[model samples]
Target: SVVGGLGGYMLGSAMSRPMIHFGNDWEDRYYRENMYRYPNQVYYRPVDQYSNQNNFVHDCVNITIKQHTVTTTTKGENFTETDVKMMERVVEQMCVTQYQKESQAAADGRRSS
Candidate 1:
């Protein structure tokens, strides 16, 4: 079976189980902290609420993703980069998650613009 036991905290290594979380911080934070990635989704518009004048509010959603980086973390046989898209994927994605709410500050070099 490719899925089982809810994936054991998403430890994604050569042997780590899968992570089928609901994309919440309480559980998703673990994957965001340590491990590599394969960029599965980044264009899902999960929100769009706009209003102004009275409430003065307007907004939408934009998802972004990236690949994993680095290997050989002293306990695993991890592996790790290139031209044009040679920059480290982790740095940009460090702020990209289902919990990011920097829509206003993102465009000004705050989040992953």
Candidate 2:
């Protein structure tokens, strides 16, 4: 089920587990590099199989609009170093990355909408 507001998107339905994958980049060195040079964005699935995909990509854009943050008792553990550097290329790349693929189940001519 889809959750979150204009500034966020949530993956997975409830019950099994709850994960928090947000603007924190350094957690993964790989994704960190991504939040760096790429400055792109994700699908409910994968975006490019190589691009930033899901979390960071969306964060890059949403954070532009909301620019909302966390920890440090207030900033949510993400540092200005990570946040600031990525914002530069976030918007420009968003226009081109304007590709959204919704998850549609099986189609049928005889099935109800």
Candidate 3:
């Protein structure tokens, strides 16, 4: 029974080993540029090892929401309200995806346990 349990554990571990990949330039660069920034350090490890890191179960929605707002406004000139709103929605989706992934990962842990 112990060996069977161990086998199951190994299988579960293997199944979850793969990280969500960024297959394009934008995705890769976005992560690369900010991989050293605040919330990313808390979520991703080693920063540059984007492909090999594991996702931590953390709620980063608020952090991303704020960062996007600040960066888009402060780094540029004359951002309109509409521009801000557009950026807001973009970051909102990004945060939502993170929440979904972390939630699914958490659910997987719960299911296995």
Candidate 4:
């Protein structure tokens, strides 16, 4: 019954899909126009409408903390200060974008009502 309910909810309207496209562009095109974009940070989620909402700040902070554990062997050493700063900027924008989404959702709800 839970699964059925979720399926119905997801398929209930075409408007349910949120930011459908994320990372599917060339590298220069990605950076030239897509960098600093909140949508770029979110991976594609096909079943997002049927799933729980994402905590942008929480997840970004987790990544900031835990990404240090990830080691890149191909080149040199650990996560650089640049990497840390980049993540900080990412978290900042994520917070802003999530807030923007909340504001937009409230506006849309008012319209629908």
Candidate 5:
């Protein structure tokens, strides 16, 4: 369970970069840079991972999530605190999904005869 949570957190932290730079109101940001340039999975998987990580960070106050999973590999004008938080939230969301599935599996196990 904790592992899943951590994984979500990692995913979230890694995605912050794309979200801040590419998450503008219009598709300009998405298209301008050859739209197909960025990895959509980075944006979405992290969000999903966050939801699965901690159910949207709605009540996750004490949770200590990594600022950036790609920190060591990332550099220059891309790593912002806002992006870090966005990525973390995504991880938390992913953690939630994992927890839900585990809970379901446990529930089903008890019912199975």
Candidate 6:
């Protein structure tokens, strides 16, 4: 009932099946982007959603982080600085987008109240 076991826990728990919905801008892209941009220095997370009644938001964030880190390190160092920066923006945008979506969802929940 816990629904534990992430999308890709074995490979490194970095691959989320539904794609954590990090945000459309950053979403749907490959994990190499983040590694290239930061070169092992980047750090981030989706803007927290206060209205997320459940822990789904937390889970989403964790999943995204896992993918960001695991994918880069496991795949080997092939991404360049340019590529990393490009993917960095993508990841950031995804976070922003997902934040907005969660906020809207929260607002909707309130409206229904």
Pick the lDDT winner.
6
The lDDT per prediction is 0.27, 0.36, 0.34, 0.35, 0.36, 0.40
- Ten-residue region with minimum lDDT total, candidate 3: 9-18
**What is the clash count of model 1?**
3
- Give TM per candidate: 0.17, 0.26, 0.31, 0.29, 0.32, 0.32
Residue pairs with backbone atoms closer than 3 Å in model 3 (clashes): none
Residue ranges of candidate 6 with Cα displaced over 4 Å: 1-69, 107-113
For residues 44-87, write the lDDT of model 5, one tens digit per residue: 12233332333434433224333223332354325245444444
**Residue-pair clashes, model 2:** 6
- What value does the lDDT take at residue 67 in candidate 4? 33
Return whichever of 3 and 6 wins on TM-score: 6
Q: Any residue pairs clashing in model 1, and if so which?
A: 37-68, 71-78, 71-79
Cα lDDT for residue 45, model 5?
26
> How do the residues 18-43 of candidate 1 rate in per-residue lDDT, one tens digit apiece?
34443567435644444344333222
Better of 1 and 4 by lDDT: 4
lDDT of 4 by residue, 84-108 (tens): 4444545445544543454354433
lDDT of 3 by residue, 40-76 (tens): 2112112122221123212223333344445544545
Candidate 2: segments with Cα more than 4 A from true spot: 1-3, 7-76, 99-113
Task: Judging by lDDT, tell me the better candidate of 3 and 6.
Answer: 6
lDDT of 2 at 62: 51
* Greater-TM-score candidate between 2 and 6: 6
Worst 10 residues of 4 by lDDT: 9-18
Clashes of each: 3, 6, 0, 0, 22, 6
Error of 3 at 6 (Å): 39
